[PDB]
């Protein structure tokens, strides 16, 4: 416990030490919400693995080092607006609210994963996490428009509902891809002159299902 606790600590050094957490509220973030909360008891033995992992309903919580990079490519701040789409275990809107001290929404479409979700966030103290059950291909309009919008299922495309839901200045990260399972990894900025899209390189996530993503 403090021994699942001490094997994190290494793997956020390592992290560190390889250059994938690169500022100190990321850093800050891990070392307050350790994988182990947010995955089921029979794989918190690999939590601090830099692998991805199962959850319930065929899904699974990304690779320790996938969540650091959007995170960082995210760029928080305090008081910023993020929508997360795919919350899956809710490990990684814990941690975009430990960065941004505010409400964090974010979208599951599964209800057993709604529920897992936020259970997962009570036990480990979290209250600023609000996860929603729908389809996240069509945002939540209710809170727009967001600072970023980071998307943890794969898409065929980029949504239009989560551009419109962009602050201009804001940024979208997104799988993206012609193949459910893998994808290239996109950081869409809606900039005052225009969609400017970064590729960051190929990975392997879930498919994003819905009205603005895969049927
Ligand atoms: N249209 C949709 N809206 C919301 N969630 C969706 C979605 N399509 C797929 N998902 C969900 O996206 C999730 C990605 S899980 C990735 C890990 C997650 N961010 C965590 O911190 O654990 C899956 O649970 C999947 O059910």
Sequence with gaps: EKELYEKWMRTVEMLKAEGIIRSKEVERAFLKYPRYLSVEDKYKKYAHIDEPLPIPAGQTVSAPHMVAIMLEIANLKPGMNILEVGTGSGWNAALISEIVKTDVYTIERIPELVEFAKRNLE???????????????????????????????????????????????????????????????????????????????????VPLIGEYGWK
């Design 123 to 205: 036990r480990a103290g979290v209250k600023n996490v609000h996860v929603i059950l729908g389809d996240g291909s069509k945002g939540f309009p209710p809170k727009a428009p967001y600072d970023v919008i980071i998307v943890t299922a794969g898409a065929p495309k980029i949504p239009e509902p989560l551009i419109e839901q962009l602050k201009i200045g804001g940024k979208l990260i997104i799988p993206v891809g012609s193949y459910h399972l893998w994808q290239e990894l996109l950081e869409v900025r809606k900039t005052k002159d225009g969609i400017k899209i970064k590729n960051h390189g190929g990975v392997a996530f």
